[PDB]
Amino acid sequence: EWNDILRKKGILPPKESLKELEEEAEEEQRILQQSVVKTYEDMTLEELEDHEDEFNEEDERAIEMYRRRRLAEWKATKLKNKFGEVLEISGKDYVQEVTKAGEGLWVILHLYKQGIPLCALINQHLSGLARKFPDVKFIKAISTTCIPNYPDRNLPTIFVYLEGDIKAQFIGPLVFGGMNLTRDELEWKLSESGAIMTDLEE
Template identity: 60%
Template sequence: MQDPNEDTEWNDVLRAKGIIPPKPQETEMTEEDIVNMVESAIQEKSEGKPMDKMTLDELDDIEDEIDEEEERIFEQYRKQRMAEMRAAQMKAKFGEVREITKADYVDEVNKAGDGVWVVLHIYKDSIPLCKLLNQHLSLLARKNPQVKFLKSISSLCIPNYPDKNLPTIFLYFEGDLKKQWVGPLNFGGMNFKCDELEWMLAKAGVLETELEAPPKPEVKDVMNIAIKQSTINDTNSDDDNDWN
């Protein structure tokens, strides 16, 4: 009896008429299957440590133990890993609050680069709240090295800048001014905490935070509230007079 799986013209006719079942399809190995197999083999040789967790030295150590096909895919992994490490280094290129003057402004702020947030604090050491903000900014700079934190003494950065506007914080993204906080009322006094500043910067999109809510209710504009309340009282007083 003829094998129904055999490749013959007669079997092709029988398959076309549905008399015998179609020939079983051979399972083809995809590129992803090959990558997974090589990945498993390399992981065994590296004592189970995933490649994306290896340092470049560890990758070099196992390079001699792989065959030609493994080497091709291994080299792709190595290039990808180097690119990831370079990207991480680029993101982590700041990490401190740098002092600038007016002469540095264009290069440090307007030409900060693609994807870079700049936090610029205009201050005077003689103002206690400015000193407090500089302490908070130093902590946040170490915590967020991908953000460029700068500070500048007001008289050296903006001539004749009034002290009543200090502290001032400017937020730039890719050289464009996105937000500014001018004057002490924005920061709530000497009890202002680092977490509060972190929340403000996160809300503006400068950095990510693990804080789930503002550390304390946002500062309200007491003067505006008083004016509105006074207007309401005056209106009510006029209405009362109309009834007399």
């Protein structure tokens, strides 16, 4: 009564506010439910192999167009699978790959001294990663011949380079310390460098 008369006249009490927030949130919640079916035919590339449970009609215009774009995508992605073995170049050439390493290609510049299970396990993880991402340039070597008399208490130091610009750093075991460190966590860190797009729990 009196409060709503106040409301017509004044705004001294606030009580009619904030009832639009949950309204808009629920609107968007109902809206975002059509994204599952919007791209049902626009994601899978095996739907042709999924005959008799995916076909209702074929317009042969946008769907053959989908095959065309899909095959272009496939050829573009499989023309780049050239790697998969971490390689040991020498320090003499080092200037030629710190700089002349290709523009638009990430370089995981790994430096290490073999012998500690830290460096050994890190080398194992990156070598196994090479089996998954053959589109990434891996480099392994002895830092002593890469950097003269490099402090041996600063290994293994991960370097992320492209066009001579350091984008990501992971210096020493201070960020990799522990035998509990695993495959997916390394992949997670290199994804966080901005090179890879994947998903992990933690």
